[PDB]
Design a protein around this ligand. Structure first.
Ligand SMILES: *[C@@H]1O[C@H](CO)[C@@H](O[C@@H]2O[C@H](CO)[C@@H](O)[C@H](O)[C@H]2NC(C)=O)[C@H](O)[C@H]1NC(C)=O
Ligand SMILES: *[C@@H]1O[C@H](CO)[C@@H](O)[C@H](O)[C@H]1NC(C)=O
Ligand SMILES: *[C@@H]1O[C@H](CO)[C@@H](O)[C@H](O)[C@H]1NC(C)=O
Lengths: 68, 72
């Protein structure tokens, strides 16, 4: 369910159980679902985690190195 | 005496080339790999190669540490 569509391209969304309109999936379970498939959503729109921001969800990993 | 110490700092920056992700181009991470080091986030990553990774500088002239073997 999408609300508050702006020109900058910003909206809010929340997820609901398939026919139970009263059952809203909690925000902590949607953040874990988006973190699992963020690389797949970025590729469908050609964005790169700085052009597709989920406010409240941050990229975390990536330790650098190689010289042994 | 000191003019040949500036050349030893130039030789340290020449040895640290020959690699495409140059060592002064990015910050290292924390113990917990979640964010950058606290004084690399406030300052530049080039300042966290000269002051902390090359010199390992202290907070005053009145306290000195050890010989810092890689600059020896
Ligand atoms: C739709 O979802 C609501 C929850 O949002 C379900 O309501 C629960 O119903 C059970 C038993 O009927 C109660 O024990 C829970 O306390 C209810 N939850 C809340 C938050 O009130 C409702 O049953 C669901 N409907 C269907 C058809 O699955
Ligand atoms: C960061 O990780 C280390 C494990 O090496 C741990 O000892 C330390 O307590 C952690 N710091 C925080 C703030 O959790
Ligand atoms: C200099 O570096 C060593 C390890 O390389 C560290 O133990 C020491 O605390 C550093 N000195 C200062 C003043 O931070």
């Amino acid at each position: 369910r999408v609300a508050n569509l702006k020109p900058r391209i910003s909206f809010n969304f929340f997820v609901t159980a398939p026919k139970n309109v009263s059952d809203i999936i909690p925000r902590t379970e949607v953040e874990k679902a988006i973190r699992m498939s963020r690389s797949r959503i970025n590729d469908a729109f050609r964005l790169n985690d700085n052009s597709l921001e989920f406010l409240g969800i941050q990229p975390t990993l990536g330790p650098p190195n190689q010289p042994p | 005496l000191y003019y040949n110490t500036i050349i030893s700092w130039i030789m340290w920056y020449l040895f640290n080339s020959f690699q495409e992700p140059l060592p002064w181009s990015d910050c290292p991470l924390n113990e917990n790999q979640t964010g950058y080091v606290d004084e690399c986030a406030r300052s530049s990553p080039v300042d966290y190669f000269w002051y902390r990774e090359t010199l390992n500088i202290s907070t005053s002239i009145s306290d000195s540490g050890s010989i810092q073997w890689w600059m020896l």
